[PDB]
Design a protein around this ligand. Structure first.
Ligand code: MG
Ligand code: MG
Ligand code: MG
Ligand code: MG
Ligand code: MG
Ligand code: MG
Ligand code: MG
Ligand code: MG
Ligand code: MG
Ligand code: MG
Ligand code: MG
Ligand code: MG
Ligand code: MG
Ligand code: MG
Ligand code: MG
Ligand code: MG
Ligand code: MG
Ligand code: MG
Ligand code: MG
Ligand code: MG
Ligand code: MG
Ligand code: MG
Ligand code: MG
Ligand code: MG
Ligand code: MG
Ligand code: MG
Ligand code: MG
Ligand code: MG
Ligand code: MG
Ligand code: MG
Ligand code: MG
Ligand code: MG
Ligand code: MG
Ligand code: MG
Ligand code: MG
Ligand code: MG
Ligand code: ZN
Lengths: 204, 136, 123, 38
RNA sequence: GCUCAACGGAUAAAAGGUACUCCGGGGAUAACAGGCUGAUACCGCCCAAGAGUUCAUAUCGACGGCGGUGUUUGGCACCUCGAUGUCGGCUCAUCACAUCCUGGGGCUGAAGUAGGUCCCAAGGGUAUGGCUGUUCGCCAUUUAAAGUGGUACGCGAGCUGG
RNA sequence: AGCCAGGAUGUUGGCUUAGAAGCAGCCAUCAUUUAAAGAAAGCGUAAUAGCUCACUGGUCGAGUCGGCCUGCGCGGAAGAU
RNA sequence: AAAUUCUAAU
RNA sequence: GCCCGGAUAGCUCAGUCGGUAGAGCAGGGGAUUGAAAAUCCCCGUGUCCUUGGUUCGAUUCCGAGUCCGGGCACCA
């Protein structure tokens, strides 16, 4: 199922500095719960909150059944209390936003397998006198599964053009998959996170 | 892929491949492939044949590789003219003369070694035969 | 005697005024289309609130030609313009519900009896 | 019919017959086993 | 007494452009085409881990191996420098088959209709337009189909000149 | 090689899984009656079934069955006046 | 003679 | 493809002339403030890109390699 390592992200919602203080307290709570489970917690990244805790702390928790237990902590958490950054004794309400993610294999297969490539060789255009006319010094490669087309005619050698055009094809087919993965994870984070505004919450 | 860990010299002449072979007997196992033709074995061919013969005996018994590819073969890049130096090392080969034993195998039935020595020879460019131990 | 690039009028109330022939269907290397032949057209202008929009790609049937038709006794019938009735790509059925001007006897087939019925007169 | 440079027996019903200077394989059980050398 | 190191040392003393060019020679030496070769290119075949619900071979074929052709890019520098006019388009073609359609068959994971793949077969046929000088390619709409190559990558004492 | 006959007994096994029973894949591969018969080589079920082979008896009845070394041939083998 | 700031529930 | 330059602390960067590595920012503790910053005091830095070799000893010297930056790739 899903009993793997997790990424725990918690950031400040409404409140400002007090939200940062509560984020620090909440992260400390989770760190203590993890250390009393024989789990390892590592700070992948930190953005501190001026007075107290963190504007945004993201950590990676490694262990057994981590995601099976921590996957219900997503959403918003509300805190009502007398803040430390308050001259008077006024009670204030603030919120923090928590997301929990799994980890996935990230293989990047260079599908440069030539069994699914269409290659065309043809003449080039420009100033070349009598040699350029009677020679196939321009290359074009199309990758059939994805429909990505790249052509090269910059040099006088067919071999050089083929090599660098193939390299460009590989790079610009890898980018088109990295972007898709990035937008998928960003969307998932967006609908898991919510918008910390002390009205959408899971616990008070 | 077998290859010397370190070598005194980077490149080497071409030479010739005349004469018969020393090491025409089986010394460790009970069966082996003896080479009949003359040529070269690349390290890619030795590993390709060893995997086919290994998979056929179901990881039973012992297998000896009795040749080593310790000769560097150079090759010029593409679409260049002559001369201007010597090419770069690309692969390693082992010269084969008529008579060498290429592999050994022990711990398996006599009829099973033939089957595994049949799939192994199919990956090699040199005609081979099957031999057994001799008392003297 | 209709080729590609030929402009034709329209002889129904489908909302088009001038259409331009872009293909003569029926065979390879086919040259002309006479009365009773299906062609491929594009709309060049249309009524503001018609059934069809300018730039559409449809089919049509030729019902009047300047070159005319010839009859088995040697006689001919000629008009003063080329006209067509708009059909749809799939069902081969007329789009409008009215026909303007006369038609001819070469439409007396089961495919175009919907046009023969609606026409003011048949020549 | 499968045309290949190496015809071989694939089951126990396959037979080797040389007809008109051509070597071919036929078996009475599996029609997929018939083949000729070419 | 010389890094006269271009080391048998030209003067004590010295850099470039020519598409505005010019003379004497060379196929002793390059760019086009021919030639030898076939690394590269394209097409076949051998073995069979395997995928295919099960099942190596209905359809594919990992690791390796063996050949054919002379369409590509090359290697060589054998012919031509007292001259063999070089891309594409037009008109006109002719041959090979490694067959796009039509024709005859075997297997199928072939109910039918439609297909996949492999044999035999060269008689005939085998698009019009938009963009670009374009070969190539993308797109729109047709067709039974819009084949792959050789011929100085056919064809300027047959046309053009982008 | 044909031609008749047989070609048996507790594994509805735990071992895996819903179901795996000789023939899906993990182990073992004993014993009995017998002239023979494998606790399964093949075809065949979701799982059973069902269908062959080995092996063993009768007629026939003279030869028959596969490796090794060698000579010459066969296929693999498609291009352009 | 120098010197910035104090979110959001009274 | 050819030639040239560079790789040193968490980040930008100086330095050897074979025995020994620094600066600014950042980092940790403490002062001042009702509190945060600015200001003050005290304290730590790193297998000098990878590899093989010569050396008693290599960041340094000599061959290979990777990555990064620049110049060149012309006559047909
Ligand atoms: Mg120029
Ligand atoms: Mg339009
Ligand atoms: Mg016949
Ligand atoms: Mg000199
Ligand atoms: Mg000299
Ligand atoms: Mg001028
Ligand atoms: Mg002269
Ligand atoms: Mg010379
Ligand atoms: Mg010279
Ligand atoms: Mg030449
Ligand atoms: Mg010549
Ligand atoms: Mg399988
Ligand atoms: Mg040629
Ligand atoms: Mg050539
Ligand atoms: Mg010459
Ligand atoms: Mg010479
Ligand atoms: Mg001459
Ligand atoms: Mg010349
Ligand atoms: Mg002359
Ligand atoms: Mg002349
Ligand atoms: Mg053929
Ligand atoms: Mg024909
Ligand atoms: Mg005839
Ligand atoms: Mg144009
Ligand atoms: Mg032709
Ligand atoms: Mg050619
Ligand atoms: Mg030409
Ligand atoms: Mg041509
Ligand atoms: Mg001429
Ligand atoms: Mg003339
Ligand atoms: Mg001009
Ligand atoms: Mg002009
Ligand atoms: Mg032969
Ligand atoms: Mg501020
Ligand atoms: Mg305030
Ligand atoms: Mg401090
Ligand atoms: Zn068979």
């Amino acid at each position: 199922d899903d009993e793997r390592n997790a990424f725990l992200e918690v950031r400040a919602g409404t409140g400002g500095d007090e939200a940062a203080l509560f984020a620090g307290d909440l992260f400390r709570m989770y760190s203590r719960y993890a250390e009393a489970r024989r789990w390892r917690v590592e700070i992948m990244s930190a953005s501190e909150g001026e007075h107290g805790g963190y504007k945004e702390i993201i950590a990676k928790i490694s262990g057994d059944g981590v995601y099976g237990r921590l996957k219900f902590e997503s959403g918003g958490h509300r805190v009502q209390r007398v803040p430390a950054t308050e001259s008077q004794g006024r009670i204030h309400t603030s919120a923090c936003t928590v997301a929990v993610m799994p980890e996935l294999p990230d293989a990047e297969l260079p599908d440069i397998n030539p069994a699914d490539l269409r290659i065309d060789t043809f003449r080039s255009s420009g100033a070349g006198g009598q040699h350029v006319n009677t020679t196939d010094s321009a290359i074009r490669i199309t990758h059939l599964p994805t429909g990505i087309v790249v052509e090269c005619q910059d040099e006088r050698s067919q071999h050089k053009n083929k090599a660098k055009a193939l390299s460009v094809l590989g790079a610009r087919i890898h980018a088109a998959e990295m972007a898709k993965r990035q937008q998928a994870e960003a969307s998932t984070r967006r609908n898991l996170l919510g918008s910390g505004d002390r009205s959408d919450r899971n616990r008070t | 892929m077998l290859q010397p860990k370190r070598t005194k010299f980077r490149k080497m002449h071409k030479g010739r491949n005349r004469g018969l072979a020393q090491g025409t007997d089986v010394s460790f196992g009970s069966f082996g492939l003896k080479a009949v033709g003359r040529g070269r074995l690349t390290a890619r061919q030795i590993e390709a044949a060893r995997r086919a013969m290994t998979r056929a005996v179901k990881r039973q018994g012992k297998i000896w590789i009795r040749v080593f590819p310790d000769k560097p073969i150079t090759e010029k890049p593409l679409a260049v003219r002559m001369g201007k130096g010597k090419g770069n090392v690309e692969y390693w080969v082992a010269l084969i003369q008529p008579g060498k034993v290429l592999y050994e195998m022990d711990g398996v039935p006599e009829e099973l070694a033939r089957e595994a020595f049949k799939l192994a020879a199919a990956k090699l460019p040199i005609k081979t035969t099957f031999v057994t131990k001799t008392v003297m | 005697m209709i080729q590609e690039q030929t402009m034709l009028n329209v002889a129904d109330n489908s909302g088009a005024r001038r259409v331009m022939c872009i293909k003569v269907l029926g065979g390879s290397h086919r040259r002309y289309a006479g009365v009773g032949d299906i062609i491929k057209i594009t709309i060049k202008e249309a009524i503001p609130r018609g059934k069809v929009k300018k730039g559409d790609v449809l089919k049509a049937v030729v019902v009047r030609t300047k070159k005319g038709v010839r009859r088995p006794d040697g006689s001919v019938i000629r008009f003063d313009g080329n006209a067509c009735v708009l059909l749809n790509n799939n069902s081969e059925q007329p789009i409008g519900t009215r026909i303007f001007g006369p038609v001819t006897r070469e439409l007396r087939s089961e495919k175009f009896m919907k046009i023969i019925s609606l026409a003011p007169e048949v020549l | 019919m499968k045309v290949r440079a190496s015809v071989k027996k694939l089951c126990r019903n396959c037979k080797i017959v040389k007809r008109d200077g051509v070597i071919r394989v036929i078996c009475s059980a599996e029609p997929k086993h018939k083949q000729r050398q070419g």
